[PDB]
Amino acid sequence: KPHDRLAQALAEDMAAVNALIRERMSSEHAPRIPEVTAHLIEAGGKRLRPMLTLAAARLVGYGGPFHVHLAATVEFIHTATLLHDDVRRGRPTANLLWDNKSSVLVGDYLFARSFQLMTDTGNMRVMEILANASAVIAEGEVLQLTAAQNLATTEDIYLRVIRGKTAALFSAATEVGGIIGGAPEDQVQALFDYGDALGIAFQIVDDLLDYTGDDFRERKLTMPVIKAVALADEAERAFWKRVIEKGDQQDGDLEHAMALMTKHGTLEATRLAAIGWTDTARKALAKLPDHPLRQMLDDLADYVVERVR
Amino acid sequence: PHDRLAQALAEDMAAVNALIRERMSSEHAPRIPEVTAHLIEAGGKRLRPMLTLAAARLVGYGGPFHVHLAATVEFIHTATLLHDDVVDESRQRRGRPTANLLWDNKSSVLVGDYLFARSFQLMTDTGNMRVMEILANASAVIAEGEVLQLTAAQNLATTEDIYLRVIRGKTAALFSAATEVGGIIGGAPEDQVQALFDYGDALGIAFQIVDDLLDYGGKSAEIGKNTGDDFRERKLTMPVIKAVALADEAERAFWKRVIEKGDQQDGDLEHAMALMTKHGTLEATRLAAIGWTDTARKALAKLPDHPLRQMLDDLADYVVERVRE
Numbered sequence A: 001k002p003h004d005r006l007a008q009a010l011a012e013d014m015a016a017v018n019a020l021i022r023e024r025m026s027s028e029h030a031p032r033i034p035e036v037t038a039h040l041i042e043a044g045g046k047r048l049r050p051m052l053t054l055a056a057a058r059l060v061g062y063g064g065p066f067h068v069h070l071a072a073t074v075e076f077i078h079t080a081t082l083l084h085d086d087v088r089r090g091r092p093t094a095n096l097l098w099d100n101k102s103s104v105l106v107g108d109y110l111f112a113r114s115f116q117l118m119t120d121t122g123n124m125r126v127m128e129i130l131a132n133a134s135a136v137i138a139e140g141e142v143l144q145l146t147a148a149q150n151l152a153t154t155e156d157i158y159l160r161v162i163r164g165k166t167a168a169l170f171s172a173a174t175e176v177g178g179i180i181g182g183a184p185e186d187q188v189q190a191l192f193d194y195g196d197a198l199g200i201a202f203q204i205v206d207d208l209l210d211y212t213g214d215d216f217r218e219r220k221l222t223m224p225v226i227k228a229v230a231l232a233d234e235a236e237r238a239f240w241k242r243v244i245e246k247g248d249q250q251d252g253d254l255e256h257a258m259a260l261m262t263k264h265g266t267l268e269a270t271r272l273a274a275i276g277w278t279d280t281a282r283k284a285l286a287k288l289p290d291h292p293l294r295q296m297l298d299d300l301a302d303y304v305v306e307r308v309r
Numbered sequence B: 001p002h003d004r005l006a007q008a009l010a011e012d013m014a015a016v017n018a019l020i021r022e023r024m025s026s027e028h029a030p031r032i033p034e035v036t037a038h039l040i041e042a043g044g045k046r047l048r049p050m051l052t053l054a055a056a057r058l059v060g061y062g063g064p065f066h067v068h069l070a071a072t073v074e075f076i077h078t079a080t081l082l083h084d085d086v087v088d089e090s091r092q093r094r095g096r097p098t099a100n101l102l103w104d105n106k107s108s109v110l111v112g113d114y115l116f117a118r119s120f121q122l123m124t125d126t127g128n129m130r131v132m133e134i135l136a137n138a139s140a141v142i143a144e145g146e147v148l149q150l151t152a153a154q155n156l157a158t159t160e161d162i163y164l165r166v167i168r169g170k171t172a173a174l175f176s177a178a179t180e181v182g183g184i185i186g187g188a189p190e191d192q193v194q195a196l197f198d199y200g201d202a203l204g205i206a207f208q209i210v211d212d213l214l215d216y217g218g219k220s221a222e223i224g225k226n227t228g229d230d231f232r233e234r235k236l237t238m239p240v241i242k243a244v245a246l247a248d249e250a251e252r253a254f255w256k257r258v259i260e261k262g263d264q265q266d267g268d269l270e271h272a273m274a275l276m277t278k279h280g281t282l283e284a285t286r287l288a289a290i291g292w293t294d295t296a297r298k299a300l301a302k303l304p305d306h307p308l309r310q311m312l313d314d315l316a317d318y319v320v321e322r323v324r325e
Helices: A002-009 A011-024 A032-042 A048-059 A066-085 A100-121 A124-147 A155-180 A185-210 A223-230 A234-245 A253-263 A266-285 A292-304 B002-008 B010-023 B031-040 B047-058 B065-087 B105-126 B129-152 B160-185 B190-215 B238-245 B249-261 B268-278 B281-302 B307-319
Strands: none
Touching (some): A002 A011, A011 A100, A048 A155, A124 A155, A223 A266, B002 B047, B010 B047, B031 B065, B031 B105, B047 B065, B065 B160, B238 B249
């Protein structure tokens, strides 16, 4: 699988990323902090986000060292955002095992250590990007709160939400790899486009595969729902209004929702949009050097839609 | 003292206010500045950004980046407050409802995160990696001090050294960062940077000890409006730690009951205050606070004899004015 070949190809660099994470997560006087952090990185992830920073830098010819610092920074930011989102992966969250108190404060420690780590690079431009990505994640989550169970939510808004909470960190991760590696700006832009597109595809694929039924029960406005609402008639408008905007769900509803999406072609529409975004990601890669990592990133983008091809 | 210093820094503080309003804005999530507005327009003496401005101008800096740094210090403080209120799930701040009450915990968490991020984004405009590393570290140290405060609470083994670590992390670290970065941005000699750091560290320590003292009615041990929160939360602060260290077997059982077990009943705050008074621990905490202002004042001696140096000297008096005898 592509994430496995990536991990093999980046093995040396990931050992250093792991060591930097260990070094910066430390706390002499609050063990809770690395304790809480150990769990979360010890129990979760293909670690795609730090790997994308490393791969992007190596792909544009950079031999190190500061792509490792940025990859660790990216992973700390991802981890911090997860801790705050929970106030997981079929295991007790930190907020339940300790308290909301712990999710919040450990996340804060990680966010700060990530920013402190980024300064070692001396590169103002990557630091501006990663600070912005963190801001955008927080803003996207606030907008998701705002627009929740709201039928006026458009595709455009959904795209902004998903870029917010998922795509912005992927696009930042890849972009700062190109920048730290000194890539020409066409290639920096392409790397940003690749990560952005990959992040969107991942999220759309998750939302398609749900329809299992957890997003429905949560009354989530994900893409196939949004497409089905816009095309709703008089009766279909009432069915969405009831089960999404009012939460009154009964047996048969999930199947009816799936029946309406199929009727309006919006599950296939969502699936092809996801494929579409993987195509857009792969297209951006054609601007990058012909390096074995480029093929691995091409494969990774294909892999995103492997279950739905 | 707060107001003289404020009037001398009026123009810079206007520029700080402006950058804050500009960077707390959100094009996609209006709740963010609504929530931020609601914390900043709820009073606050704004000592922390003043400390940065004063330090930079004291070493002869003409701008512009002391404004950026002062705004960042305030963003960090504001984010810290928003998160401290989710953590102990507080209903009021400065007599008005908290962001988390008015909205929800997730909002106060996410707004604090937004401001924290924007503040680091802003710092990159300065091009100075050193001050960025300092302010990042201080942010980490704040979070760490807050986690330490949690493990220290309910725990009678907490020592004065641990307490000093908690307050240094939670409170002093940002005061010391604030002054230090002002010296650095102004290109001051490293001995002046260190003196500004030491000034800020001592003042911040004094500042927290004064709050902890006033929480138990001050030297006189008098019950009023702003007393009893630390006792209810079973925090191990100086006046408690000192009384616990002097406790005989029966007194220790009282402290065990009300602090460790948390079985607090009517009259128990006043009983605690009576033990503090018997053991001289409120006066002792007063002395610790005024001692730290001595240390702060001594640190100033290495700085140039500028009107701002004298105003920082008066500010040290001001921080302990409420416990003067």
